[PDB]
């Protein structure tokens, strides 16, 4: 299928004392594979998947130097942004950055991205063309002009279309046993009386990977959203994901309702119905 490599960085200023808290995480698809936390003892980029531990000491040294350099860029950014927005030196502020690349089923480049936020709002982002910048406000417009004069988008485009894709393909190969394995959802339906006249039917999808999934209810073959509840997809804690969808129904009418499950790991979507003797 399609694949992606993404890096996420958050720095939070600490006005009372010291440097910002900095946390970096790298993912291949929905699998975390590296991390850096400025509060941790190692002060190194650390592995979080078995297939990345295959990499040699030059890799780990290089990733640690680069991730610490990202932390210092965020530290300078926080100071600059405080000045741009004429803010007090007393408050805590946040910078977030995400970048990465997507590839298709053939592992060729599809799309690249590089985006920044300040205090949880868009600040500046590279456009889909990997040439231009989207500045959300006039402070970001100043950054945009500076970056247009310093050839920044060219270097980012070269990384996103080149290096990013090349390392993604290397990791997909090295970690094939898990990264190229699809875990189809393990599905079941539960029934919970809500009164002596009605009951909730809950359609579960467990232990699946990747996270992308669709759960829909139908009544007599047509989509149903009234009296339904769909929870956000959530991590199981072992690398897989979970989700459920529920519908409130008149008791005795359970057979009209079907839950439909769509996922990359299923050749054909699944259909579930309540088994009345369950």
């Amino acid at each position: 299928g399609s694949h992606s490599m993404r890096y996420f960085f958050t720095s939070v200023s600490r006005p009372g004392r010291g440097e910002p808290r900095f946390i970096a995480v790298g993912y291949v698809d929905d699998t975390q594979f590296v991390r850096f936390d400025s509060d941790a003892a190692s002060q190194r980029m650390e592995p979080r998947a078995p297939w990345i531990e295959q990499e040699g000491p030059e890799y780990w040294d290089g990733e640690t130097r680069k991730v610490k350099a990202h932390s210092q860029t965020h530290r300078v950014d926080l100071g600059t942004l405080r000045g741009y927005y004429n803010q007090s030196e007393a408050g805590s502020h946040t910078v977030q950055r995400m970048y990465g690349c997507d590839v298709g089923s053939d592992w060729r480049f599809l799309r690249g991205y590089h985006q920044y936020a300040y205090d949880g709002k868009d600040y500046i982002a590279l456009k889909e063309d990997l040439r231009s910048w989207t500045a959300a406000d006039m402070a970001a417009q100043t950054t945009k002009h500076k970056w247009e004069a310093a050839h920044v988008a060219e270097q980012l485009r070269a990384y996103l279309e080149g290096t990013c894709v090349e390392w993604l393909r290397r990791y997909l190969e090295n970690g094939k046993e898990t990264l190229q394995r699809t875990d189809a959802p393990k599905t079941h339906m539960t029934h919970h009386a809500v009164s002596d006249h009605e009951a909730t039917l809950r359609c579960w999808a467990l232990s699946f990977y990747p996270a992308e999934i669709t759960l829909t209810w139908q009544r007599d073959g047509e989509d149903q959203t009234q009296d339904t509840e769909l929870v956000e997809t959530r991590p199981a804690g072992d690398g897989t994901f979970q989700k459920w969808v529920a519908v409130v129904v008149p008791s005795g009418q359970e057979q009209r309702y079907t839950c439909h499950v769509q996922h990359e790991g299923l050749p054909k979507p699944l259909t579930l119905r309540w088994e009345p003797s369950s």
Partner: peptide
């Protein structure tokens, strides 16, 4: 692998 960007705000 990480980039070495010059995205200084």
């Amino acid at each position: 692998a990480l980039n070495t960007p010059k995205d200084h705000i």
